[PDB]
């Protein structure tokens, strides 16, 4: 079963300048805990954004989507489409699409769950930003309480499931 997991600002930004334009350790820990032991599917640009001690993401089957047939991605499985990523030779009980914006758009129609972190950070979008997908009426969700990070940002977790 396919789920998406992402963190966004309220304005809908998920990425900027090849990374994520805020710091939120509670959300990184949330991501690690939900995905550990499972398959994580990502676009090539998100693979390229992973810091060194996280490339590959440890304890998870990393699957990278690219059109570059000869791509070198040590510690990851390279595939040529999202549909390939979602058709493993070796099934996983849980597969998480972990970004980026390009892959979320392709995966959202194939998914039954989205785990969304909302970050109250003032981030008016900039021209090159990666932006969150939008959930339409086929999705319904529940929201956690607004929390404050030890780092100071307000945030909260939403869980959406396909109707
Ligand atoms: N906040 C969050 O939750 C979160 C999560 C993940 C990433 N991010 C951020 O988001 C940004 C990256 O996202 P992005 O949207 O720029 O890139 P992306 O979706 O991670 O990667 C795009 C790449 O995927 C490949 N691709 C796309 N469509 C394809 C298709 N139909 N078939 C085959 N390959 C395909 C292409 O790779 P090739 O060019 O190699 O062909 C393309 O360049 C970064 O800023 C990262 O930090 C944020
Ligand atoms: C600054 O915000 C961050 C930092 C790290 C991960 C995330 C994140 N969060 C949610 N909810 N879904 C996601 N899809 C997501 O990206 C996952 C891909 C990016 O992973 C990063 C990025 C920087 C640093 C570390 C990691 C992975 C850490 C790990 O698990 O071992 C957000």
Contact yes or no for 86/110 (Cβ under 8 A): yes
Number of domains in the chain: 1
Element at 55 (helix H, strand E): none
**Residue 42 CA to ligand 1 centre (angstroms):** 7
How far is it, in rounded angstroms, from Cα 79 to Cα 119? 31
By residue range, what is the domain housing residue 74?
Answer: 1-163
64 C-alpha to center of ligand 2: Å?
A: 15
Q: Is 5 annotated as a binding residue?
A: no
Experimental method of this PDB entry: X-ray
Q: Is 46 marked as a binding-site residue? A: yes
**Ligand 2 centroid to 106 CA: how many Å?**
20
Q: What's the CA gap between 147 and 88, in Å, rounded?
A: 37
Contact 84, 110 (CB under 8 A): no
Measure Cα distances from 5 to 8, 10, 29, 126 in Å.
Answer: 10, 16, 13, 22
Token couple for 46: 């998100």
Q: Closest-lying ligand to the alpha carbon of 114?
A: 2
């Amino acid at each position: 079963s396919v789920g998406l997991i992402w963190a966004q600002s309220t304005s809908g930004v998920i990425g900027r300048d090849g990374g994520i334009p805020w710091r939120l350790p509670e959300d990184l820990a949330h991501f690690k805990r939900l995905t550990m032991g499972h398959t994580v599917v990502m676009g090539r640009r998100t693979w390229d954004s992973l810091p060194a001690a996280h490339r590959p993401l440890p304890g998870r089957r990393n699957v990278v989507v690219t059109r570059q047939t000869g791509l070198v991605a040590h510690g990851a499985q390279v595939v040529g489409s999202l549909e390939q990523a979602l058709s493993p030779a070796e099934p996983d009980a849980a597969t998480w699409v972990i970004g980026g914006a390009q892959i979320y758009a392709l995966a959202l129609p194939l998914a039954n769950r989205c785990e969304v972190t909302e970050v109250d950070v003032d981030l008016p979008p900039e021209d090159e930003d990666a932006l969150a997908p939008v959930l339409d009426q086929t999705w319904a969700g529940t929201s956690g309480e607004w929390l404050v990070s030890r780092s100071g940002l307000r945030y909260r977790m939403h869980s959406y499931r396909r109707l």
